[PDB]
Amino acid sequence: HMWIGVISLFPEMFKAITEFGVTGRAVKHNLLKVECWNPRDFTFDKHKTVDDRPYGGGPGMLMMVQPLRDAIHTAKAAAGEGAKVIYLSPQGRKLDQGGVTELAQNQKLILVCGRYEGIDERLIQTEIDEEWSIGDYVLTGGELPAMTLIDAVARFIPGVLDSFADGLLDCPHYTRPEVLEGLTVPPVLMSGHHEEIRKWRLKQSLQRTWLRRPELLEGLALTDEQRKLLKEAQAEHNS
Template identity: 55%
Template sequence: MRIDVITLFPEFIRQCASVGVVGRAQERNLLTVESWNPRDFATDNYRTVDGRTCGGGPGMVMLIQPLRAALAAARAAAPSAARTIYLSPQGARLTQARVAGLAREERLILLCGRYEGVDERLIEREVDEELSIGDYVLSGGELGAAVVIDAIGRLQDGALNDAASAEQDSFSNGLLDCPHYARPMQDALGAVPDVLQSGNHAMIRRWRLKQSLGRTWLRRPDLLARADLDGEARQLLEEFRREWLAAQCSQRAGNAPEP
């Protein structure tokens, strides 16, 4: 897969894409990340990429010409067609399901805005999709692009040393992930749950699903409302609820003042 990024800060993108799982994916030729600076395509001596907002008001807007030329160069750099995505707080919220869909594309071009954003005419004519990584505003689209690259890069076949890691991630099945532990089994901070020390894989699978359901219920009940739970999952969730409520009652009783 190839991802081209249109950005005023190409070095930032290169550094983000050179480490960790994404860096390994590039080393294994599973992913290629390239960056293009619109300033290199500006036509004036000052390499101007922004102009004042039409109609007045504060801030500057990124100009059409340098961005359009950068997009054309990125598209011409490889033969396959590329889906162009603008990172914007006004875009659809990025989800794991959308990441999985984008990971199946041959090519993507990520457009990073700055200042007050990008001239709307360029968005209407040159952009296929707008994506947001959250309901907040950043100084530019580079952090959002880095998030998209990382999320997509780790899903490339062979990027992870153990492919099952991606299958067990939070949101992959519509739920949050279960808790994870490492050795030592006993520590001053507590012990690893007995079931994880049992070697009984059926019980471990059941425990992990139960914890995943419970965590989702406690932290992201909105996800449960959309989840299609089978009979086992509904039973495990009900068990978790009963146990959690009983633990809360016990804790309150233990903290109650002496009569």
Template identity: 55%
Template sequence: MRIDVVSLFPEEVDRCTAFGVTGRARERGLLQLHGWNPRDYADGNYRKTDDRTFGGGPGMVMLVEPLRRCLAAVREADPAPVHVVYLSPQGRRLDQKRVRELAAMPRLVLLCGRYEGVDERLVQAEVDEELSIGDYVLSGGELAAAIVVDTVARLQDGALNDAGSAEQDSFEDGLLDCPHYSHPVEHAYGVVPAVLRSGNHAAIARWRRQQALVRTWQRRPDLLEGRELSKADRKLLQEGLAALEREQSTDPAEDTGPQAG
């Protein structure tokens, strides 16, 4: 997969994606990342890429022409069809479903805004999609672009050492992930649940599913709104919530040690 980043600070995205899974994907040739600076396509000695907004008010707006020329060069650099994404607070909220769709594309162009954003005419003419990573404002789109690169890179075949890891991530099936534990078994902070040490893979799978359902109900109930749970999932959730209620109603003074659930 090839991703082209159009930014006044393309090196920021490059640094953020040079390590870990994304770095490994780049080293293995699974992901090509190219940075483009619209300042290189601006006129004049000052290479101006922004100007004041019409209508008055604070802030500057990125100009059409340097971005248009830059995007034209990006398109010409590779014959593969491009999908241009503008990282913007006005965009659709990025979620795992959309990440999977983006990861299947041969080529992405990520346009990073600065200041008050990009001239709307450029957005209308050149951008295929606007994406937001959350309801807040950043100084620029570079960090958002790095997040997009990370999310799609880890889904490239061979990027993860264990291909099954991505399938168990939060949001892959619309639920949050279950809790995870490692060594030691016993610690002052608690004990690893017995079911995870049982070797009973069916019981472990059932426990993990139940924990994912309960955790989603507790922390992100919006993910369950309008979702038709299967009969088995409904039973797991009801049993899990009942167990949680019993646990919470237990008098702490009566506890004899860490709970294993």
């Protein structure tokens, strides 16, 4: 299974994944364990200070190095041999399914969540192994990015289960009723012949990947069949 350490000022936010859905069930079955450490518990003053103003002035607050460092060492300690420390940040490697598959190898990870204007550069230099971004946009804190990462990798823990399965966008899906607001379910889905249906769905994934996200298409090495189905799909669009 998998163990995840989180350093965050709002550990209760993590209940969002540790108590609901697939991940909640994973936690209940001891397949996934998530432990949180809060830098505030590492302060030594009445107001539990974990941040201050960035030098050179100007607006904003930066998190202080010491509570985070102490929290990280505590986590690393109670983590064992070889825990990799990742900092969530928009300046890090942009996360994608390949990165997710790579991340799913580590048995233990510690995730550092920023707030306000960020964290001290020296903490990044001295304690962080890798930086990961969930996308080219900026959030108010690292807790959501951390939960996103945790969820994406959790879809791999053995015994818990599929877009990008083959590098392609998923195909369209249908359920009851047979007719919805005048829209009928594709007759092919009703033939009951599993093979004709599979080929239809695959053609659909190719068509969808090609239209909405053609760049995803550039790197793949398609089977003869996939190339054929995509060309067939291509013929209908320009007609």
